[PDB]
């Protein structure tokens, strides 16, 4: 009854009421992928498939050429015990290992999280530094920059060289092509409306609504730059 | 919430502001004591205010 | 006359004649264009919708729940209770074994229940927390139990009321939680006794989310022409200003919107008597003006 | 028909969106009985409106 | 001779470190396969528009300068 | 033979065909046509309506049509109403252009810059020492958009 | 809250007509109205430039206005109003005539500056209850105001 | 970085696979998986 | 790397030892306390906290030889307006020391009034010593139309 | 050009130190272009930054314009100097 | 010659991709000249398989793929692999090989890194009866036959698993190891625990067999109620 | 000094060029000569690269 | 009325004060007509008075210039630099219009 119906009604973009989430140019988010809420994109931003990242409880910032990973959870806290606004910010070129979930914490620039990684509420990751993949990082938790972090709770074991951080920032850069790759397979006209069967709904609605603006106004003069857009 | 933007409901009530703003007193004041004022209290704001006329 | 009936006359058959015969001609040609494009293309589908999913005769009983995340996986024998919240990409395979969730218990994002036994079941009670990424096998949690992000429970496992699992914790095999305890850690191990602020804290959470659960079903279970139409308001508001949002709140607080009405414009800005104060503003403990806590300053 | 491989040819939702004077007495064609009675309502109410403009225009002209 | 996929082979018999070094050189074969296949489309992609634009281009900068 | 008869409905179009790139003729410069009335009024302007003029109407009045929709479909948060009056005043105010179009097509008739069916005895001709154009046109398309002694 | 396209279109029609007119157009090349205005090739041409150049701009506005809209409706009336009267500054035939148009193009442009958009409904929550004084409306009124009364004057 | 793909076709790469072993019996509790790869 | 007393299986520091406490005084004379760290800017911190009062009209500058840096570069063209004017507390503006050129320039060309203890929270850059730093941020003004937006 | 046929040894002079001023004040500007990160200044509709095809095309033809306008000149020269003939100064 | 059929395919796939384009821009022009809303609503654009140029997914089908997971690019599937709900097998960069009676849990992601070393493959191949628990994250790496890997395990690159080796769930795998046969591997960092018994290799054999089994009931159910696309 | 040898002539070198260390990822070692003056892959003339992988499934799949 | 350097102070205020679609159609405007008819009063409807227009052209030039070059490096905004772009331009123009009346 209440969820009995053949076609899935998922969309990878929702608002609660005042939240419009933003994407950048060139920035491809997963059809599976799952983005609602308060949720700002950056340029050339990826979001692989079966990702979820909630601002509903608060805002949500991701920077530029930055990599999210698949199965990977993203959300925000009310508040927190310092302070602090408990919103999830990510600088530019941070890549996110899959498997791993993000609280409300300062992700800096250049920032590498391994696969699998759970970052609570209050950490600080400054720039450059990386994460291996089954490691945790505590709440409130500050892992200087350029530094390598390991286990659960996570320890140190050494600096980085400038040699790994320009490997990382590379990777970075070459995860667009494939993000491009990918969103190259679809077209800018959805057709799977063509695939469904009219009903009495569709046929005769049961209310009219006034003609106050319409969507897609000057669509015909905008450009499909993505092509994942409603 | 719905219609109020960034504000958001806490658990005892909703705020009146955006998530990190900072709380107004005068604001609070007038809410919760609308129309009242036992005595005309001078604050930093009614002082200065004094001072600038 | 004659402009305005030419006028109509075009509409109709625009609208008669010229719709039909480009839908026609399009849907010719996006056919022929992906038969030439094949076998290097792929075309949308209709995903199929995998909640409430009945395999050899297990029939999901979910329809007593609150919200239940469209593209979430739920098969086979799952009862859930009323209150109860589901969120995206869970999945919830039954078949392994029945699959119990009490009432208002939250199982949030990526959150994967799989019974390692061929046919134990995996019971949850009433008021517990299950976060993102989280794992549970088979075992018995009780009510008012919380579980962290990314935390995995093993097969056998027993936690008792009150019981908190740190996020990023795993429970080892057949192991026992007691009630007011946190164990964290991989291993997962005993660490302190839970405080009430912590308690506190942790029950505050768990309502939040109960209650965002409702918001979030809200949005997602809306028809085509709801979801049309919020696209619509949407952009409008991109372009409303002042003036039109002071409008829209006007008429719904019902003042005059009309030139021959602006003359009953005291009737209902200044005639409606204002609403008594609740007898419960009169016990105030103190009345003096607040002021911000300067603690710590 | 009504279906191809995978394309429905005879899909069709209604658009819900119509302006609320659709089917109004003065959106009928000019000249019509009702286009008439809604167009003497009209010049009615405008001039009650405004007698002084309704004079110094259409008695000028 | 004829081809057989290593992967879907039945490898029992051997050793385990035999069994993974076929695997491993099966792999990289057909890799190296996957990547002259690919190579040569993105040949391709280059050559198309040379041929077809080269000749429009030169004839748009004769009449242009000349 | 370069000109539509302006008798006719298609007597609109010498409009466009003109001899020199000029708007108008030098204070002295004899018209190309013989001239038939030099100080006309509105009132012999309007008795000099031809069915040039009129066919002038009829196309705007055609292409109204598509110019008036294209101009209303930049339309948002408009009643049918005022949709269809603001369709009747853009379509009215192409008829009018059209009609003043017309007008100024009997103008030019009565004073003889548009052929007006009439040839002066003893034609004036030019010497093309200048002619950048004339293989051209003859090669082209546009030898119809331009008009030769 | 309506798009001012159609304006803007409408505006895009009638100058397109008019360059037609232009170009249809014959005559003498002589003064008409009391010698008030002058009727030439090169006042003409000056015309067309005018009138081409404001159809371009008004062709690009349309689509800037179709990207996102902070613009009235009367902004474009006072745009058209602008259109419409400064071409014929070129065909004066007289410093009086020329004087007058000019005053009338520049009671345009000041009801352009009048209707610009002052409010806007941006991301800043921070202000719901201070005073923020912004002086760029009445620098650019006065301004305005008083250089057009001094040329007007002299 | 250098994107280049190091499995070439064209020859066999000259390799010896006996100055490194990877261990495979007698491990602890403590000591670190061996490596896969041991050609030089 | 470095600036960081860890060695190999130490744990990482908490964030609440780190954080410099900042108070202000806000323009409606109310009282704010929020957090920020070493290596960044003062307006960078209080855009962070959304503390009202600051226009931050440029928005901290330019990116290149920019004012945070210790040695300041001759070649730097400093701040781009005066709307993040702040006023520190004696105590705190004495360590800060005297000011840059272009600074001083922008604060006296600054259209509201300023304090002899104003300074730019753009060109200030936090340190540990500025900890339970007392200042007061005024309303600053707006420079051209698209504050507004 | 024009100044050097008219013989304006001084006009010439004060042209090119104007010239030179304003060319360091347009330049000055590149310095400023320089960022640090890419800059996000799209509007954002449905969810999306809002890209108009419109504008774009217009600016391609003005860029191509601006590139090769030397080439194309001499034509808007004759028009320009074919609508001034018809002053008689 | 290959060059000139590479060019006339890439010229084909072009003329079509335009075809579909002016058709389906001729539909929704259409659309809304009749009135009609049917092309605007919007409708999840998840493609199960979605091949890019030249790299299409290949499975028999007798395997069951469910219809959450998504495989992408070069993927190769055998006999009666069963892929598991919401699991990702990317394979864009390289290609991905499966072999004929593995299982791949829910919520498992392989995705291969873009280069390494000399010697080293750079695409995931895994054996013939391979079983991977949900929530498993795999990157380039060689799995032999009848090797199980725990839930929530994380495989990196250059990582090569021995014919019958276990590794217990909540483990990383560092990227460049050998995992020999028949032992226990358990721990964050891989770590010794034993050798494995014919108890447990009996009992690891009957659950993916098991898992197989529960995979065919999965499909044949999905079928019955029209989730599963009838290949 | 007298270890380095980044070739494998005198100490010898690993076709991976390093041995990672947990908690890093597997990266080759930046080479000494980093030119980038370097061709698209070569193969050997007549290499045969059709994909008979997928030409069996479809064969068995029919 | 034109807003040139000696008086321009007022125009930069205007500008700071305007829309982006503000200047864009009144930098239209102001180029094409107004500086425009402003030229033809020296060079054809006014052309007998040029004995005196020219010292008058020549003074204010220069003034302009000597009192630009030091003005046009201290804005710091958008719209102060379009609108010096424009005075600048309209500096260059009246001295091409000099040259052109001598
Ligand atoms: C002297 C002092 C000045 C005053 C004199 C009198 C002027 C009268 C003018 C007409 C007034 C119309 C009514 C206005 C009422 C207002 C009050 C009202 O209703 O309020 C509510 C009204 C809203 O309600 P509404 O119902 O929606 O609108 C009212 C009506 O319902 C719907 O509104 P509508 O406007 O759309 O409807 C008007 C329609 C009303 O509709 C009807 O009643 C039915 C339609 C009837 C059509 C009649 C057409 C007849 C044409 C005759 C042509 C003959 C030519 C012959 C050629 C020669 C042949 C041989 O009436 C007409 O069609 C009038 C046209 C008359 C043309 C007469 C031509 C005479 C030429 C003389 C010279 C001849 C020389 C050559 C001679 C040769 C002889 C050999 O409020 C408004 O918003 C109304 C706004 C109207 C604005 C009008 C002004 C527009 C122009 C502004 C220009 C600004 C300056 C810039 C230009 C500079 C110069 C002007
Ligand atoms: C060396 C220095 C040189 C400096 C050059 C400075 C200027 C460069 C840039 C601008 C040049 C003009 C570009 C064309 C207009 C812009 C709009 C347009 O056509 O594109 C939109 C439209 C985009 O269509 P869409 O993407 O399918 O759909 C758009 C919307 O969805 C749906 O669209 P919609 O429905 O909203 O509107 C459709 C309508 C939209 O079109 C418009 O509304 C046009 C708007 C501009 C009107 C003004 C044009 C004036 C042309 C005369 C020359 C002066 C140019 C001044 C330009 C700058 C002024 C500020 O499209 C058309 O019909 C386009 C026709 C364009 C040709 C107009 C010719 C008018 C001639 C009138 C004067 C005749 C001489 C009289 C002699 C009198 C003697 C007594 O473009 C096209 O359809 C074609 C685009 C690609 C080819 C463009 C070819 C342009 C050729 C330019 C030649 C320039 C003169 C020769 C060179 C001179 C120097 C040697
Ligand atoms: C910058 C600003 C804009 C540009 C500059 C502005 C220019 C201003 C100066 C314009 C002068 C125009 C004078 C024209 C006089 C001649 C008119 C004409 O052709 O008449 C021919 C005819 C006469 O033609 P005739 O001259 O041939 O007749 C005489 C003929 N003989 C000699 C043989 C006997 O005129 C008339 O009969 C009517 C005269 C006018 C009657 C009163 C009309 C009042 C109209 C008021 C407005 C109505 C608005 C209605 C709107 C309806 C819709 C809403
Ligand atoms: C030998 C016998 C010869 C017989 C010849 C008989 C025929 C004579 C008439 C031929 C007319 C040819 C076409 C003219 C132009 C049609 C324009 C049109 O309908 O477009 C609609 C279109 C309307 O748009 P649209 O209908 O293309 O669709 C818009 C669709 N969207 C909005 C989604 C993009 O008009 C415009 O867009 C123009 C807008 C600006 C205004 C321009 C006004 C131009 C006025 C031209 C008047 C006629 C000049 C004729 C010159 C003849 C010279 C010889
Ligand atoms: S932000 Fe402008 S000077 Fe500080």
Known sequence: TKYGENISKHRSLMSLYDLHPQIGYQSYIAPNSTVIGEVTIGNETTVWYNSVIRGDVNAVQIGNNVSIGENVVIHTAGSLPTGQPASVDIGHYVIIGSKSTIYSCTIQDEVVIGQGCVILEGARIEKGAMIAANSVVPPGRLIPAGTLWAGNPCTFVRNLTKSELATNIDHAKKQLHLAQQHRYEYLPYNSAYLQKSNSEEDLNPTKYDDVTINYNFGDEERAQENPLKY | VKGKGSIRKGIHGEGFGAPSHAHDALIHQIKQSKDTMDYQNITNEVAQNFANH | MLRLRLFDAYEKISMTFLGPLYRRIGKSLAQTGLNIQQPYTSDDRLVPSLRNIRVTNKIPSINDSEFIAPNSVVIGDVITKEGSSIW????????????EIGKQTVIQDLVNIQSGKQNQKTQIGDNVFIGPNSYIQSSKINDNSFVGMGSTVSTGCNLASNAVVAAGSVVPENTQVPSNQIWAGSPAQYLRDITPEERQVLQEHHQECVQLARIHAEETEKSFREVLNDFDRITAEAEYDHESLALQKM??????????????????????????????????????????????? | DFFVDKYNFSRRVVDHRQPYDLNFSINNPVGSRVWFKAWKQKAIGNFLNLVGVHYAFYGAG | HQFENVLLSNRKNLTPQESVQKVINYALLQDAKQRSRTLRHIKASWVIPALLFTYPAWYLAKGAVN | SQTFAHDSFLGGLNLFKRRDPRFVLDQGERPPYPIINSNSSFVDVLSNFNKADFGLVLFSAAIGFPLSRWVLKGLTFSSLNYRRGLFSSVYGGVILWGLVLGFNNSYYRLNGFVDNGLVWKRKERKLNKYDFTSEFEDNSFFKKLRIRD | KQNPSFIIRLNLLLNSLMVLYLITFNGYSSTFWWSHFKLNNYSLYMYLLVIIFNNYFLYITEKHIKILNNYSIDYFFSIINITLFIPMIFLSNTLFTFFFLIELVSCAIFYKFIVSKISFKNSNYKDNYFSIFSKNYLNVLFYQ???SFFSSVM | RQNFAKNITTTDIPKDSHHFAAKRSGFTQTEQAPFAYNDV | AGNHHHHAGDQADRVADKIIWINIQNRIGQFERISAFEGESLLEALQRNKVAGIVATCEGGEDINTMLEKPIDPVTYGPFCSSCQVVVSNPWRNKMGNLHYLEERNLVRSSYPTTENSRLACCILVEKWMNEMIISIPQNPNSVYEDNM | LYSSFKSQYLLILFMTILNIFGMYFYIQNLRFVVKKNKSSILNYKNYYVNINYSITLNIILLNFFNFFGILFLSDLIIILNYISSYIYI | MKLFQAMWTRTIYSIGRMVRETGLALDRYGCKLE?????????????????????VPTFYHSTFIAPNSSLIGAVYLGQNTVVGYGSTLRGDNHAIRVGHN???????????????????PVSTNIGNHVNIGAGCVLQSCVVDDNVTVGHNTVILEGSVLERGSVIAPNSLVPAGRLIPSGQLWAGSPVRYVRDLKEEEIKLNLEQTEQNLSIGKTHKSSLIQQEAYDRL | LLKFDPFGFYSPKLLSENRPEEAMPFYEDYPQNDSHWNLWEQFPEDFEDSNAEREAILKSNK | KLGIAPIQLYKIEIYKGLPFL??????????????????????????????????????????????????????????????????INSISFILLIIAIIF
Not at chain 3, 262 to 276: D, G, H, N, S, T
Not at chain 11, 35 to 55: A, K, T, V
Not at chain 11, 102 to 120: F, R, Y
Request: glycine share 4%; hydrophobic share 50%; with cysteine.
């Open chain 3, 251 to 297: 008429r719904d607080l019902g003042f005059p919107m009309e030139g021959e009405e602006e003359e009953y414009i005291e009737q209902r800005v200044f005639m409606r008597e204002q609403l008594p104060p609740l007898e419960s503003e009169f016990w105030k403990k103190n009345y003096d003006p607040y002021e911000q806590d300067l603690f710590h300053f």
């Open chain 11, 102 to 120: 593995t299982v791949i849990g829910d919520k498992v992601a392989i995705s291969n890194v873009a280069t390494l070393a000399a010697g080293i």
């Open chain 3, 88 to 99: 995206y990409g869970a999945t919830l395979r039954g078949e392994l074994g029945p699959i």
């Open chain 13, 22 to 87: 503000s200047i864009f159609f009144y930098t239209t405007f102001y180029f094409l007509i107004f500086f425009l008819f402003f030229s033809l009063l020296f060079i054809y409807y006014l052309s007998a008075l040029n004995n005196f227009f020219w010292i008058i052209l020549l003074i204010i030039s220069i003034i302009g210039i000597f009192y630009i070059i030091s003005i046009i490096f201290d804005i710091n905004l958008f719209k102060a630099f379009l609108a010096y772009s424009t005075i």
């Open chain 7, 145 to 147: 105001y008083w250089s």
């Open chain 11, 35 to 55: 009135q009609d809303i049917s092309c605007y609503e919007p409708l999840s654009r998840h493609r199960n398989i979605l091949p890019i140029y030249d790299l």
